[PDB]
């Protein structure tokens, strides 16, 4: 239970940095589309693995 709690807490750190950088993600749409697709592919690999 403590391990799962730490995993959720660590995940919040990634979301905090993403929200603070959302103002620049819209301006960088030239490469954010390709980078965003790569992130989803990594998540699918973890779920499939």
């Amino acid at each position: 239970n403590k391990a799962e709690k730490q995993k959720r807490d660590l995940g919040e750190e990634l979301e905090a940095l993403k929200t603070e950088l959302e103002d620049t993600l819209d301006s960088t749409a030239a490469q954010q589309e390709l980078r965003s697709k790569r992130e989803q592919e990594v998540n699918i690999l973890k779920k499939t693995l």
Binding site: E12, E15, A16, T19, E20
Partner: protein, 49 residues
Amino acid sequence: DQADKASTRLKQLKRQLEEAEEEAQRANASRRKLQRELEDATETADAMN
């Protein structure tokens, strides 16, 4: 995270507001100095007539 993110943005607005207020002093001070020069031109125009 919202409080820290909101607090961080509030601090950024504080420095931005101070920068705008500081620039207003130079612009306001320059406006007063320009008014003094304009008064000399108006007085000189009377002597020119």
